Design an enzyme around this catalytic site. Structure first.
Site, short mmCIF file in Angstrom:
data_model
loop_
_atom_site.label_atom_id
_atom_site.label_comp_id
_atom_site.label_asym_id
_atom_site.label_seq_id
_atom_site.Cartn_x
_atom_site.Cartn_y
_atom_site.Cartn_z
N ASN B 107 74.44 39.86 118.74
CA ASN B 107 74.32 39.35 117.42
C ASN B 107 73.31 38.27 117.13
OD1 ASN B 107 76.21 36.91 116.88
ND2 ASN B 107 77.25 38.29 118.22
N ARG B 186 81.96 22.41 117.92
CA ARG B 186 80.56 22.81 117.93
C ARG B 186 79.63 21.59 117.92
NH1 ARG B 186 82.88 27.50 118.34
NH2 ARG B 186 81.77 29.34 117.54
N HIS B 263 77.95 36.33 108.08
CA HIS B 263 77.07 36.48 109.23
C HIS B 263 77.83 36.72 110.54
CE1 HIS B 263 73.43 36.12 111.58
NE2 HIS B 263 73.80 34.99 112.15
#
Lengths: 282, 282, 282, 282
Positions: B107, B186, B263
């Site tokens: 991806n 993250r 996405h």
């Protein structure tokens, strides 16, 4: 599973008696699915969904309905906007067979009818699987009428074997699929007086004041169920660009496109189509 | 199956030693599949393919590789065009592990690398599954840089928690997926000195004279294997219009689009994505 | 030609008195043209069409109307679907000034109003020139809300100078056009209590049951006049893909696209836009 | 201005002597413009640009060149990729006439040649005007070969009047433009032994190993001049979707689309086309 073993008739009311022919299979399976075949003057449930019915019947209770004007259903000399007409007939059948809410599988013309039905009788339509569907498609780039539409119109004007062959050849990516025995078979069905009547009725219906009912790209934003749009990348009848509005406006839409596949997705990608449909329908 | 149980390292040669981190699972399964994760400065194989690896491991021998600059692979302060760089590293790994021809799942950034690899080492790449892939996409309608690209650029300029959150929120259709614990996780990874170095290296590589290697929409007409393009209809990083050239020019292409999906297809439509991939890969 | 020399007021009836501000120029020219400006909380006829009015006035009798909620027209705290609301006001003005059928030039929000007007009062609208028009556009590929729409929404939520600047910067391809004096000028206008009221009224109107009136892509197939759609290739508010349905369905449509041009076509390509409009309008 | 008064010949070198026929007009005007006509076996500069040359000659020094294989230029029995072949011939003519950098007007096949020329001899091509151009177009949605391409192929196979008429009818939106005298005129030209030779040479050239030279959508990102793409919305030869890659990738591109206009933009929208071209070319 033969034509004869699955054949059924029903009489429904659409401004009076209308005989509908259909095929029933997978009786005893819990989930009913209705299949609605494509256009082409000699087309019918059994030939349209030849590579599909038996496979789908393993998992579902399949009802593949000959749309009025096709197969062994009544071929009236006149009707209104076709998809709404066929949807009215289908509603009659739903009521008569005691169907509640049921998923619909529709290609081409039959996709337009599945959509018209799902819009007109919203509670009765479950998930939709639509292969190169008419009606909800609007070809944003391809000039209309498309090559596929023009070739069908030519046959309607001049119903010759040659014109039918030229039409059939734009249904598929792999033109070797269009054999002489296929052409002869469709032509024999296509060229009956009763088929000619249906073709005539169809042409006349285009000029109706109820034409808006066919512009379903204007309405599909109202569909609430999941909808799987399936296209052959090389569709020359309802080309790929016709998928866009429906993809954008149906909240729960999906789109699957097959490269090296024409208008007849259910034939040219029969295995992939079968598995996609089985998975989508649970 | 834990991060630790599947963790592996390899040293490959790309202008000298390069350490690659990867995850191995489904050992004993016959068909090897390589997974290549997406972009985003704190992204890695394990978090990217969290809802996927275990499922895919039931059927395949899975190798999910941290791309140079990401996860626990080396983070050099400079490199050339990224996809070609990562593809060189992958080739090293293929050779070292004795892989022949193997399907690739990629991806975003990782899709670009799968494609670069499949073009540069044509005999080594089998079927491709590419989710909102960079590189082969060209956004025919969306002005570049897209909102997703701009938000990533802003973080690279000003690596703040707030900027990372704004970036993450355009990765998904369902923004409730962007929790505080996700953002914090993250950000911690994203804001290490070594991650900052990689981000810096990446930005600098854009200005390289080998930029053509990234314009893969120019080359994919050469791909001979089946390729399944998968998109979230609501992708705000590599939007849907970026699928068109690849769909048209790859002879054996398919496209699947999910409505109500951003996405991160592998996360937001994890079950559907999983089944699609398993079926496609045999 | 100054703001003051061309300034005019009119009181029209839209559920009671509504004051409309407009600019009149080229009096003595035979062909009247109505200009309808774009959105953005501090926008108005004079600033929107600054590089245009004087040029167009050489050839036409120009009426550039401040749309309710903007400039010096009334800013009510509530209304229905905005385009229909503004179209009602415009009809009042047409009647009051004795205009018959007149061409309309509309950008963005003002394009939506020109279209709503042309649909609601078909006999009163002549040729249309529409620059990155709202309402008739439907972004087939770009996820909604677009970046331009999101940035406007952010300002409406948090009306800060910084948020207005971020919004203005996505109006143009050449961001050097967004100077500090431009930002300060728009912010002063944008941040008045009365502008805030209008912004509030607008946001609330979206949630109206008359929302269909805004989905004009469903209706434009009914337009009978020539229509020139003009787009900046890099429009980040109403992107190019939003032109397609209108291009396909308006029988006498034309489309002109400018590369290296953002949402503000009339500013960034002012000379080209001017000449296109003059030629189109005869 | 008659065929005869403007007729000129030149001998250029393309692997040996090649005679080029062209028309010269507007001598004494300062700005030279080169026009490159479309395909169709009996087509030529004079008939292609009949509604254009005199108008353009008022403003420009016009050179309308018969492309090798067409009109009164040499019709060799073999050549390489056609656009590169014709571009080589054009370069010879430029050098011979002492042209420096000159804008090019090209339709269809001639648009492909203008583009090939502009890519191969970058310093020699000024602004480009390209009407439904081949070569740089790639039909992202329309299955290839398109209806227009198929109809031309049929004539090449069976050069009958009937096949030429069917081909001509897909060149235009208004099919009344395809009169019997038009058909007879083109057929007489189309069916000469020498035209048949050219058609044969063309068909054979498709199978060349230099086919990449025709895939100009891969290269136009390199064009530095303004380029005006002009399309008939109803183009059935090179349909509208073929404009997209060129629109996106040419930095200084513009696109103009005419509704109710087929492949022959210069004929069906001759006045609008003329004015657009004059304005664009300064």
């Amino acid at each position: 599973l033969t034509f004869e073993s699955t054949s059924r008739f029903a009489e429904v009311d659409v401004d009076g008696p209308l005989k509908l022919h259909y095929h029933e299979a997978g009786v005893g399976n819990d989930q009913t699915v209705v299949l609605l075949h494509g256009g082409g003057p000699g087309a019918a449930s059994w030939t349209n969904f030849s590579r599909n019915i038996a496979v789908l019947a393993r998992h579902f209770h399949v009802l593949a309905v000959d749309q009025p004007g096709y197969g062994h259903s009544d071929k009236r000399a006149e009707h209104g906007q076709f998809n709404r007409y066929a949807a009215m007939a289908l509603k009659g059948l739903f009521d008569q067979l005691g169907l509640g809410r049921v998923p619909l599988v529709g290609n081409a013309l039959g996709g337009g009818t599945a959509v018209r039905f799902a819009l007109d009788y919203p509670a009765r339509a479950g998930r939709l699987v639509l292969m190169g569907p008419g009606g909800l498609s609007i070809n944003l780039f391809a000039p209309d009428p498309t090559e596929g539409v023009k070739r069908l119109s030519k046959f309607s004007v001049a119903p010759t074997r040659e014109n039918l062959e030229a039409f059939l050849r734009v249904m598929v990516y792999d033109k070797n699929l269009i054999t002489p025995e296929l052409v002869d078979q469709r032509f024999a069905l296509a060229s009956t007086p009763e088929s000619l009547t249906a073709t005539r009725a169809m042409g006349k219906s285009f000029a109706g004041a109820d034409f808006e009912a066919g512009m379903m790209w204007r309405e599909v934003y109202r569909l609430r169920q999941p909808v799987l749009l399936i296209w052959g990348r090389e569709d020359r009848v309802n080309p790929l660009d016709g998928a866009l509005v429906a993809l954008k406006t149906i909240p729960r839409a999906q789109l699957h496109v097959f490269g090296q596949c024409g208008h007849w997705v259910q034939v040219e990608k029969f295995d992939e189509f079968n598995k996609l449909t089985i998975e989508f329908l649970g």
